[PDB]
Ligand binder design. Structure first.
Ligand SMILES: [Mg+2]
Lengths: 44, 1324, 493, 98
DNA sequence: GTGGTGGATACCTCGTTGTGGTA
DNA sequence: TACCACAACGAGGTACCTCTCCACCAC
RNA sequence: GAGUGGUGGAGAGGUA
């Protein structure tokens, strides 16, 4: 209710939301992929 | 002894002479249901009580009423085996005769208008078996007794609620048996309140305000009266000496000439002695003492006619001036104290905004039904209905007992509703509790919790159903036709039968029966559950209800509870624990008589136990003299202490009476810790019966009690000699002494061969008597599933060594020899039922036939021409048992093949096929063959019945012939079958012969007509499910040998899992050459503290030493005198043993049969808490020519050499539990899927996968295996495209992963979007 | 994936924005929840606007006061009752004007509780004007319908159809919406149409959250119905039941037992579970070895269980790990990956060192076997979750592969010493001669002897010097020193 | 005192030796060995086996007046076992809430 | 068979969070 | 107007296995 | 264009 009122968005940077959504987690092995994807998305 | 008791005399070790036999262990179920169903016209219990408590019932005007006449229960048209097979309730019809008497409205009471009476049929109440089990829908269910809080009043107090103050708040509560509660409580301001059924608080005086009471009655009822008297502008105080206790003097309380107290001085008890020794009454009191007091009664001025002051007003100087000028010379005043009479009711009267009964009733209706537009008649009707309606409030005859005996009264009767003085006295005791005199109640003291059993619950459900049908039939009769209406048209039999069937089928307490073994049945019947309707839950009941209250001593076992979330909510009933009249629990106790315990047995309930002092069973008695020690031990007043040998009142009745049945079956109970003995007494309840039942050598003497009273053996009814014993049935010829002459003199004991249990184990009955062998009444004849000769025999006893063995018994693990498998000591039988139904689609009925398409001779070759497996073909998993096919198109066109298959992992033979049908489909060759075999076996068995019956009735007619006249030579010179044609002159014996021949022909008539009844019931269809045609049921019977993974356990909570089946050469042996069978783990003993297995291992080795010496003497065949001497010396052994057996009364063949029965060991009885001490065990071992410590010197079969230290070896009784590794192991590669979330299923039946839960997701997260977590949440799970690419890629050899958004996340998106909150996936 | 919509006749209130405390309407309109509840219970009227001085804006009136206002003015004001009244009020309320009024009215006095409520309302209004939502949108006019395959309808075995709760809830709201439609085009009396509006409002509040507003409407089987909020939230809601933890394919389960003959990285998988778990790998190897051409022939060749299938399984298993999970997987080391070895039987064999990490006792504990599929997951289960990599627990740098109770009894019995047992005071060349003596039996395990031990001191760098002297020890300690590697001193043993 | 005498009379018992003298050493007793190596159980459990079981507690936080003067070799009587069940059921409900 | 549909139990234990009451 | 009882909502362990039972009405 | 239903939900009991 509060998030719908405020119109929030989630940046998808935690392990719980990346486990819900279904990508690699931003830890362990997947941290290299996540910093690569975030520098690609910042780079264009 | 009996003839079966001479067959094997179990040696005792107990020393206390037991004084009471073990009671009939199923008395609670049978006595409660017999009280529910039995016709009591005087002592109203059950059905007659409910009928008379609802009948009669009149109309709205009163011109017609229904009178109850009588009721009778007919025969069940099916017996219990037929109901178990067919899958239906075993029940009797309830036929009630009922009278309709119509009244006239022309006359004032025109009773003679029209008389009508008939029997109306309503309801089908289910009956009980002989041994306390109900049979519903074919299955055997058991209704567990319930332990709710009894009706009445319970004064309680929560300690530490207002954490700022920490004050105690005593709260009362009136729990009735039926209706609504009534809760009084204080606040931290010490104001009484009323909370009817967890609504808001109300000022507590409003109930008695609604009860037509004014404030004057309130103050004179609750507060004691003090009197001020104004005289010539001074105040005279009438003073009783019981008022100045523990306070400070406001003024100088003096006398006419005596001084007692000073200013600001505490009134002392010596000063009170001075006042009671001078005995003055009137004392003058100054003006400042009045300021603080409160006026009792109203004072209206006589001149102006208005009220100077009402009741409950604070006095002041202007107020006393107004009273003196009005002239009220006598002043009534309340008594206010802080010690014994606190200002509580006065404060609630002050804060109470109501004034009269009208405002009280509209306020209480505004609370009870809020928001409704209130009125006076609705408020008063709901108030009468809420407490003082007989049809809306019942607590009688047990709550009336507890209410009077908690209100310090004497009589145990009264009315079934509350009343004014009753609520007044409850409030009075609450104020006494609040000021200090009295004592609060605890809530788990067993004078408060009451056993509510199956009879009471069934009567309550019958009463609720009858009330609903009474309301319906009154709504019918109030306007319907009077003269031309029979009552069977107006009594709808629907809600009674629906209610009783609902209770016996789907209640909280009618639960499915675990019958792994007779112990499980008996301790599932004697079970005390505290859950269900009216009791607590398995969430909302913390440490208080679970803990062992000290009044559980003797009534409830302390070491038999489940270990799950029901750690104290499921009590088990102790051995000797009976039930009261009202329903409380009670134990037997022996009365002392001037220091002598006379064997008259007084029963003590939970409350009457507390006032006496009770001695303990371990207290010694000197041959019916007195105690030895002057300071005996006792338990008293809720604890334990010491007392004198004359001050006592009662002694224990035995020493088994603390523990229940199951924990009494454990030997050496007094040496196990309570945790591990609880683990053992729960793991004896799960022992699958093995192939040949084998007795325990170390028992407790309760085994014969469990196997007899568990109702699974075939115990004789009248003693006699056996006439013919078979493997299928035993018949017996009765003694002529124990025969009544009206009968024929032959009982028949049919046995149930290889029938499925409720947990798919086997149940059969092998006979234990041979032909030409006399038995007495109460003897055993046929052993049950896990019984050896009428003893309970759950597992097998086997050789045990206690040492580490190359790691293979590491952390509670068991290493089992090969010879345990080779002797097949642990191969159970599992009988499994598979069902096939011919449903009906709307394209034709499904066909059971062998012309199935798409199949060949790799499957159809086991089946017959009819499409049904033979009786006896060994199937394997996945083969067709019943070939069923379904019309696919309209009526090949039967293309879909819906045959049965054996589930993968099930094997074995097909012991029975049973086929049911509906009338409407014509049978086939297989159904005709099954019904022909049933017909022929029914005719065969009932004609054998007729044949032994004509043997008996020909004995009967030869008896009446030799009684009437003397006719012997023509009686035996002529065949016995033509004894109906012989006769003489017509007299009473001739007429008896004609009527007995007519009785024989009528026996033939009921014979052939019950054959025709079973014939038409098997040819005609049974009342099956809606929309089936014929039902074929098969029964597969595997034989489960042991293998690594089958759980095993002794009796003392030493569970294990079999780790290796070593060969006989690798098992350790001893120097004589005998290899040991189980190498247990020695480190299981010293920390878990179950020393019972160590003492039982030593005693088992002693027992086998004696049995081995007897086997040596028999195999050398020494002498019957040497056998008699050795066995007599073996029995007359202990110090002060209870039993005594002399073999001079035993014959030669008797002692030969006894030595043959003892050649496999000498069984021993170690009573729980009367056990065999280690000196007695070492005496037994010295008799056996063994090492006295029990430890022998084992060798090593692996490398030949010697173990360095002596190893303990004996014979512990190992079970085999119901956790079999074949049922446990399950795997899944790719299978079924759910519909909502598209993730795989869950469970071994649906072939589902293991839930990789949240904790395992955190495990992968904190490892960092991100790719493993992603592939475990997308492609191994709910993602259809990714999993299809994954499966295809793995088959092609390349392991690569294309992920995607999971289907459960898409479900969550659709659910929030349908909830109305716009959630979407924003790109970049 | 398709959605439906319901045209509601009357507007209605979303119960989340009425009963999720604080309701956001009770803080939006600055009115108490009791008054808004009495409006939506259809028991009282509120004027929207009034030109007279008697009726101020947002003044709640009872029905008697309502009809008194009708006989007094009747024309100038407008007092309505129900969700359309609060919908019109939400339309008429000006967000920027009232937040400016709040910002000018805050700064005069600063009392704590009223200042808190005022800054709560300013955060609400600023969040609304930031997000661009409308305050009118809290009132539902078009109620959406879930896709039909997420409230599915599969029957029972006997043809009787057992639905979900949502079909019943939607049936109730659709039937009462049709009856309200019939009464609006019939132009019913106002008491009847407001009673049916009450019942529609209660039905849609039940649909959005059953056990929330009042009496939860129970199902046909004497149980409360499951709403959309009860299908989302919970210990068995969608999140914590099917999103965080999923049931998974490629997974077995069995009773555990003890394998002392293993090594640190091995577990004994049964034949049957391994043949089931590695089934598509077996299909792939069968098609690669030219024996299988189609999927049906591969399926039936596995389900016939030939010796070529057993050989192919023995080749597939070779150095391909499996994850032996145990639940309750409390700490991090509850999942470890082992290279499986094939056994017959039906029970997973563990090492005895890892059953301290698992807190396993072999008295009937069951464990799961999860397979990794991809190359990334096999390399993660070899290089991260192997049993030989989590030696030390992450709670303390002290190892978790400690011997436990039986190895401990054996090593204690090895390294303890008696006084004059058998052959004490001998002199031995080393562990080889000492163990030859003990296995021959000429000297017991507790004789105090002298031995020559060539222990290896490791220096400051990684070089290994060899020193040699005579130590006065036990025969058992001399035998254990043969096991102890090169690099440790002797006072260890 | 009973626990101290028990641990002494368990620890130093293999005294029958020779070849120096009648020497006193640490014992090869099996219960003491399995408790002394750190294998299974500790001195409290050994005391409960051999010495004195001690003062068990009522569920209300109190201490019972009379202790369990027996142990798990001589075997308890009825009253000491009924006392012990208080601590047993308190432990096994403590595990559920814990 | 095919649309229609409204009433006679109580028996957790904290622990935050919001609300009318009153010195 | 700042403390304050009082009321209302919102938590309460993971994994597994076996069994039974499922809305009334109705011209 | 080529076989097929429990999960759903309740209640009761059990294992670690
Ligand atoms: Mg375990």
């Amino acid at each position: 209710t509060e998030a719908a009122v405020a119109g929030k968005r989630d940046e998808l940077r935690g392990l719980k939301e990346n486990v819900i959504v279904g990508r690699l987690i931003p830890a362990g092995t997947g941290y290299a992929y996540h910093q690569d994807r975030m520098r690609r998305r910042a780079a264009g | 002894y009996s003839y079966t008791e001479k067959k094997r005399i179990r040696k005792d070790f107990g020393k206390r002479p037991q004084v009471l036999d073990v009671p009939y262990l199923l008395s609670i179920q049978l006595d409660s249901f017999q009280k529910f169903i039995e016709q009591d016209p005087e002592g109203q219990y059950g059905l007659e009580a409910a009928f008379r408590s609802v009948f009669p019932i009149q109309s709205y005007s009163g011109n017609s009423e229904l009178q109850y006449v009588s009721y009778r229960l007919g025969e069940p048209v099916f017996d219990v085996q037929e109901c178990q097979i067919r899958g239906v309730t075993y029940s009797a019809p309830l036929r009630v005769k009922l009278r309709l008497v119509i009244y006239e409205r022309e006359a004032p009471e025109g009773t003679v208008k029209d008389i009508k009476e008939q029997e109306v049929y309503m309801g089908e109440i289910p009956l009980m078996t002989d041994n306390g089990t109900f049979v519903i829908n074919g299955t055997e269910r058991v209704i567990v007794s319930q332990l709710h809080r009894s009706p009445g009043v319970f004064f309680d107090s929560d300690k530490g609620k207002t954490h700022s103050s920490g004050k105690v708040l005593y709260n009362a509560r009136i729990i009735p048996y039926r209706g609504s509660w009534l809760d009084f409580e204080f606040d931290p301001k010490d104001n009484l309140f009323v909370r009817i059924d967890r609504r808001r608080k109300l000022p507590a005086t409003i109930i008695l305000r609604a009860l037509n009471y004014t404030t004057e009655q309130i103050l004179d009822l609750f507060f004691e009266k003090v009197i001020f008297e104004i005289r010539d502008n001074k105040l005279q105080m009438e003073l009783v000496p019981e008022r100045l206790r523990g306070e400070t003097a406001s003024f100088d309380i003096e006398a006419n000439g005596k001084v007692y107290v000073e200013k600001g001085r505490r009134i002392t008890a010596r000063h009170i002695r001075q006042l009671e020794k001078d005995d003055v009454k009137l004392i003058e009191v100054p003006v400042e003492y009045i300021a603080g007091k409160v006026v009792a009664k109203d004072y209206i001025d006589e001149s102006t006619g208005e009220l100077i002051c009402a009741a409950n007003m604070e006095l002041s100087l202007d107020l006393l001036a107004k009273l003196s000028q009005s002239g009220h010379k006598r002043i009534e005043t309340l008594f206010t104290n802080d010690l014994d009479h606190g200002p509580y009711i006065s404060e609630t009267l002050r804060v109470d905004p109501t004034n009269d009964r009208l405002s009280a009733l509209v306020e209480i209706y505004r609370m009870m039904r809020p928001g409704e537009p209130p009125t006076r008649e609705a408020a008063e009707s709901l108030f009468e209905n809420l407490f003082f309606s007989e049809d809306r409030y019942d607590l009688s005859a047990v709550g009336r007992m507890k209410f009077n005996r908690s209100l310090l009264r004497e009589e145990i009767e009264g009315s079934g509703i509350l009343s004014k003085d009753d609520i007044i006295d409850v409030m009075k005791k609450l104020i006494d509790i609040r000021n200090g005199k009295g004592e609060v109640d605890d809530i788990d003291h067993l004078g408060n919790r009451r056993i509510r059993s199956v009879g009471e619950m069934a009567e309550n459900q019958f009463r609720v159903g009858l009330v609903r049908v009474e309301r319906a039939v009154k709504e019918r009769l109030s306007l319907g036709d009077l003269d031309t209406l029979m009552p069977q048209d107006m009594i709808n039999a629907k809600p009674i039968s629906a209610a009783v069937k609902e209770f016996f089928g789907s209640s909280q307490l009618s639960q499915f029966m675990d019958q792994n073994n007779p112990l499980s049945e008996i301790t599932h019947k004697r079970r005390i559950s505290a859950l269900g309707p009216g009791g607590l839950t398995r969430e909302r009941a913390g440490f208080e209800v679970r803990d062992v209250h000290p009044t559980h001593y003797g009534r409830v076992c302390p070491i038999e509870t489940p270990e799950g979330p029901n750690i104290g909510l499921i009590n088990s009933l102790s051995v000797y624990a009976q039930t009261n009249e009202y329903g409380f629990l009670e134990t037997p106790y022996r009365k002392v008589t001037d220091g002598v315990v006379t064997d008259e047995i007084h029963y003590l309930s939970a409350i009457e136990e507390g006032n006496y002092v009770i001695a303990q069973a371990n207290s010694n008695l000197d041959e019916e003299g007195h105690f030895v020690e002057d300071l005996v031990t006792c338990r008293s007043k809720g604890e334990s202490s010491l007392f004198s040998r004359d001050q006592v009142d009662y002694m224990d009745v035995s020493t088994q009476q603390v523990v229940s049945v199951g924990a009494s079956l454990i030997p050496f109970l007094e040496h196990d810790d309570a945790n591990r003995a609880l683990m053992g007494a729960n793991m004896q309840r799960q022992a699958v019966p093995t192939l040949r039942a084998d007795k325990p050598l170390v028992g407790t003497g309760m085994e014969r009690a469990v196997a007899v009273d568990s109702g699974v053996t075939a115990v004789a009814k009248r003693g006699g000699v056996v006439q013919y014993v078979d493997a299928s049935r035993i018949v017996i010829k009765v003694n002529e002494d124990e025969m009544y002459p009206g009968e024929a003199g032959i009982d028949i004991y049919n046995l149930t061969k290889y029938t499925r249990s409720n947990q798919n184990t086997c149940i059969n009955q092998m006979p234990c008597v041979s032909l030409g062998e006399p038995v007495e009444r109460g003897d055993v004849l046929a052993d049950g599933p896990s019984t050896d000769l009428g003893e309970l025999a759950l597992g097998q006893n086997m050789r045990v060594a206690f040492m580490p063995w190359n790691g293979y018994n590491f952390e509670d693990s068991i290493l089992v020899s090969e010879r345990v498998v080779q002797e097949d000591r642990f191969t159970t039988i599992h009988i499994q039922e598979l069902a096939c139904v011919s449903r009906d689609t709307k394209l034709g009925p499904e066909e059971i036939t062998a012309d199935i398409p798409n199949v060949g001779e790799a499957a159809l070759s086991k089946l017959d021409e009819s499409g049904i497996v033979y009786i006896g073909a060994e199937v394997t998993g996945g083969d067709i048992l019943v070939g069923k096919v379904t019309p696919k198109g309209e009526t090949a066109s039967d293309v879909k093949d819906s045959s049965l298959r054996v589930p993968n992992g099930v094997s074995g033979t097909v012991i029975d096929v049973q086929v049911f049908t509906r009338d409407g489909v014509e049978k086939d060759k297989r159904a005709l063959e099954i019904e022909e075999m049933q017909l022929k076996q029914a005719k065969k068995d009932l004609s054998e019945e007729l044949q032994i019956l004509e043997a008996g009735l020909f004995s009967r007619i030869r008896a009446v012939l030799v009684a009437g006249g003397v006719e012997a030579e023509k009686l035996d010179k002529l065949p016995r079958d033509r004894w109906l044609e012989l006769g003489l002159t017509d007299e009473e014996k001739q007429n008896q012969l004609e009527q007995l021949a007519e009785q024989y022909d009528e026996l033939k008539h009921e014979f052939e007509k019950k054959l025709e009844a079973k014939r038409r019931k098997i040819t005609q269809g049974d009342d099956l499910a809606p929309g089936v045609l014929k039902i074929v049921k098969v029964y597969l019977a595997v034989k489960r040998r042991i293998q690594p993974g089958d759980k095993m356990a002794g009796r003392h909570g030493n569970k294990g899992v079999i780790s290796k089946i070593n060969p006989i050469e690798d098992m350790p042996y001893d120097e004589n050459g005998t290899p040991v069978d189980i190498v247990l783990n020695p480190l299981g003993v010293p920390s878990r503290m179950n020393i019972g297995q160590i003492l039982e291992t030593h005693l088992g080795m002693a027992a086998k030493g004696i049995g081995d010496k007897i086997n040596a003497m028999l195999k050398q065949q020494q002498e019957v005198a040497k056998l008699r001497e050795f066995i007599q010396r073996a029995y007359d052994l202990g110090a002060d043993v209870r039993q005594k057996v002399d073999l001079s009364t035993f014959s030669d063949e008797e002692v030969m049969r006894l030595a043959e029965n003892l050649r496999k060991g000498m069984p021993i009885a170690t009573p729980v808490f009367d056990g065999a001490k280690e000196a007695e065990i070492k005496e037994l071992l010295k008799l056996g020519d063994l090492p006295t410590s029990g430890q022998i010197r084992l060798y090593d079969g692996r490398t030949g050499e010697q173990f360095e230290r002596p190893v303990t070896v004996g014979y512990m009784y190992m079970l085999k539990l119901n956790h079999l590794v074949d049922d446990k192991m399950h795997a899944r590669s790719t299978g079924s899927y759910s519909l909502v979330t598209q993730q795989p299923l869950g469970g071994k039946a649906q072939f589902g996968g293991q839930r990789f839960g949240e904790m395992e997701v955190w495990a992968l997260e904190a490892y960092g295996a991100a790719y493993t977590l992603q592939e475990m949440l997308t492609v191994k799970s709910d993602d259809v495209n990714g999993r299809t690419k994954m499966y295809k890629n793995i088959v092609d050899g390349n392991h690569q992963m294309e992920p995607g958004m999971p289907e459960s996340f898409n479900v969550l998106l659709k659910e929030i979007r349908s909830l109305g909150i716009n959630i979407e996936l924003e790109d970049e | 994936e398709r959605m439906g919509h319901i045209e509601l006749a009357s507007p209605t209130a979303h119960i989340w924005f009425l009963k999720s405390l604080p309701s956001r309407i009770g803080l939006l309109l600055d009115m108490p929840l009791r008054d808004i509840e009495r409006v939506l219970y259809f028991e009282s009227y509120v004027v929207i606007e009034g030109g007279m001085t008697n009726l101020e804006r947002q003044q709640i009136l009872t029905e008697e006061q309502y009809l008194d206002a009708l006989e007094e003015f009747g024309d100038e004001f407008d007092a309505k009752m129900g969700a359309e009244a609060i919908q019109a009020l939400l339309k008429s309320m000006d967000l920027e004007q009232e937040c400016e009024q709040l910002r000018e009215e805050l700064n005069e006095t600063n009392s704590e509780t009223k200042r808190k409520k005022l800054t709560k309302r300013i955060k609400l209004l600023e969040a609304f004007v930031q997000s661009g939502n409308k305050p009118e949108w809290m009132i539902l006019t078009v109620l959406p319908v879930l896709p039909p395959d997420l409230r599915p309808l599969v029957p029972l075995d006997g043809g009787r159809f057992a639905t979900s709760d949502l079909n019943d809830l939607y049936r109730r709201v659709i039937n009462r919406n049709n009856r309200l439609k019939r009464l609006l085009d019939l132009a019913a009396p106002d008491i009847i149409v407001r009673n049916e509006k009450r019942m529609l409002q209660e039905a849609v509040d039940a649909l959005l959250d059953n056990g929330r507003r009042g009496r939860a409407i129970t199902g046909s089987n004497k149980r409360p119905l499951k709403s959309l909020a009860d299908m989302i939230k919970g210990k068995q809601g969608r999140f914590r039941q099917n999103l965080l933890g999923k049931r998974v394919d490629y997974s077995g389960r069995s009773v555990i037992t003890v394998g002392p003959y293993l090594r640190l990285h091995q577990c004994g998988l049964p034949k049957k579970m391994a043949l089931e778990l590695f089934k598509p790998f077996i299909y792939g190897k069968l098609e690669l070895r030219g024996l299988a051409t189609t999927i049906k022939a591969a399926k039936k060749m596995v389900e016939r269980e030939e010796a070529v299938v057993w050989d192919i399984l023995d080749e597939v298993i070779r150095e391909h790990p499996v994850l032996l999970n145990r639940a309750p997987t409390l700490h991090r080391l509850g999942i470890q990956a082992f290279e499986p070895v094939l056994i017959e039987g039906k029970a997973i064999q563990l090492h005895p060192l890892v059953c301290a990490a698992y807190n396993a006792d072999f008295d009937g504990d069951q464990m799961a076997v999860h397979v990794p599929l991809t190359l990334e997951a096999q390399l993660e289960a070899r290089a991260l979750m192997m049993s030989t990599n989590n030696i030390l627990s992450p709670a303390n740098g002290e190892p978790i592969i400690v011997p436990s109770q039986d190895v401990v009894l054996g090593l204690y019995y090895m390294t303890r010493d008696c006084v004059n047992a058998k052959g004490e005071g001998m002199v031995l060349t080393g562990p080889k001669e000492a163990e030859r003596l003990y296995r021959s039996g000429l000297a017991s395990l507790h004789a105090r002897v002298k031995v020559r031990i060539t222990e290896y001191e490791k220096d400051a760098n990684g070089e290994l010097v060899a020193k040699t002297s005579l130590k006065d020890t036990t025969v058992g300690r001399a035998i254990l020193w043969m096991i102890v590697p090169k690099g440790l001193p002797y006072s260890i043993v | 005192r009973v626990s101290k005498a028990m641990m002494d009379n368990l620890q130093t018992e293999t005294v029958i030796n020779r070849d120096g003298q009648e020497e006193k050493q640490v014992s090869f007793n099996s219960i003491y060995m399995m408790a002394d190596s750190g294998a299974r159980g500790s001195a409290a459990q050994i005391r409960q086996l051999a010495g004195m079981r001690g003062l068990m507690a009522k569920p209300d936080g109190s201490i019972i007046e009379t202790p369990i003067t027996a142990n798990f070799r001589e075997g308890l009587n009825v009253l000491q076992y009924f006392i012990s069940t208080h601590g047993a059921r308190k432990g096994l409900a403590d595990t559920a809430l814990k």
